[PDB]
Amino acid sequence: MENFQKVEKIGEGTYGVVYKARNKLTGEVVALKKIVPSTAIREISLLKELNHPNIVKLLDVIHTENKLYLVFEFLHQDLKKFMDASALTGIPLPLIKSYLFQLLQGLAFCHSHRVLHRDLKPQNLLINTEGAIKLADFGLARAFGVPVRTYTHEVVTLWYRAPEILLGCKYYSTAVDIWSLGCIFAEMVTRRALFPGDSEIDQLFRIFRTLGTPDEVVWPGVTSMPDYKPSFPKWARQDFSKVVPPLDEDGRSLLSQMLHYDPNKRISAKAALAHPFFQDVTKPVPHLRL
Ligand SMILES: Nc1nc(OCC2CCCCC2)c2nc[nH]c2n1
């Protein structure tokens, strides 16, 4: 670590404090994440080759003193902050579309190498001043788990968790990332989290209250998920026109496919990139004060 000068604390991530740091011998300004089991080291080393322009570059993995430090490319803002800052007029649609579109490319890339994020959230989606948006912390969940509370006891958000994870499916797939990104897409659009659950049950019930309590018709096998209970209330599905109003039909079409209950029906990242929603996609520059 002596090769890094901490510039400022950027935040408290899932696994440890995130610092803006400067690499003393490269001159590079990086994001330094203090997170070691051999399994975690080999997984993490696999992440170093997962390179894609909508994936926050993993510059180096420093394994010293028993201590694990990941050095990432530094972006200048996360999507939560950018949404919070854009709350008054919201993020212009063409920008939403461009981020969604680039996030899907980032997903398609990782998913094609069988790597899931598992923990997508606005805070791990980082934007630059040019209009790019990238996924940070890809593959970390599989390397070190997703805790209930972070190392600061901060509560890990459930707002973006796929229903098959809430239902205790142990073996969930790349569909959980599409679900999360669908939730983030809706939040960009409406400027309100779609499902801000504050407990697993509240999260699940929130889902059900909007999309209908899932049953065997829409999701074969749902009733035999580990945490499914026959006693769950049976809520009717709400129309998507009421759920993300502003959004045009191609947007709502795509979001309902990203939000399919059955993970096998849920649109893949690559099919989502061929959705007519992206027909006029462009790459606008965000209004970004740094
Ligand atoms: N500019 C910035 N921020 C990060 O994390 C912000 C996350 C830190 C967790 C608190 C939410 C903010 C980065 N990660 C890799 N590059 C990064 N660049």
State in words which class domain 1-76 has. alpha beta
Torsion region of 137: left, alpha or beta (phi above 0 gives left; psi -120 to 50 gives alpha): left
Q: How far is CA 72 from CA 29, 69, 87, 266, in A?
A: 9, 10, 28, 31
Method: X-ray
Q: Which residues does 55 contact at the CB level (< 8 Å), separation at least 6?
A: 106, 109, 110, 134, 135, 138
Alpha carbon of 20 to ligand 1 centroid (Å): 8
> CB pairs under 8 A, 24+ apart, for 7-11?
11/123
Beta carbon of 31 within 6 Å of any ligand 1 atom: yes
CA dihedral (47, 50, 56, 58) positive or negative: positive
Q: Cα–Cα distance between 64 and 67 in angstroms, integer?
A: 5
Ligand 1 midpoint to CA 127 (Å): 10
* Rounded distance between C-alpha atoms, residue 212 and residue 206, angstroms: 9
What CA dihedral angle connects 258, 262, 265 and 271, to 10 degrees? 30
Buried b (16+ CB within 10 A) or exposed e, 242-257: ebbeebeeebbbbbbb
**Structure tokens, 281:** 């996609």
CB 30 within 8 A of CB 74: yes
Phi, psi of 271, rounded to the nearest 5 degrees: -70, -35
Ligand 1 in reach of 126 Cβ (< 6 A): yes
Domains 1-76 and 77-289 agree in fold = no
Q: Give the residue numbers annotated as catalytic, written as ranges.
A: 119
- Asked if 237 and 217 touch (Cβ cutoff 8 Å), the reply is no
Q: What is the DSSP letter of 196?
A: -
- Which residue, 132, 159, 119, is CA-closest to 56? 132
The domain limits of the chain are 1-76, 77-289
Joined tokens for residue 263:
């993970």
Ligand 1 atom closest to residue 14's alpha carbon, by position in its atom list: 9
CA distance to 14, 56, 77, per residue, from 8 (Å): 18, 19, 14
Distance 223 CA to ligand 1 centre (A): 38
Angle ∠(106,288,82) on CA atoms, nearest 5: 60
User: Is domain 77-289 given the CATH code 3.10.20.30 in the classification?
Assistant: no
**30 assigned ligand-binding residue:** no
Does the beta carbon of 123 lie inside 6 Å of ligand 1? Answer: yes
**Secondary structure (H, E, C), 39-89:** HHHHHHHHHCCCCCCCECCEEEEEEECCEEEEEEECCCEEHHHHHHHCCCC
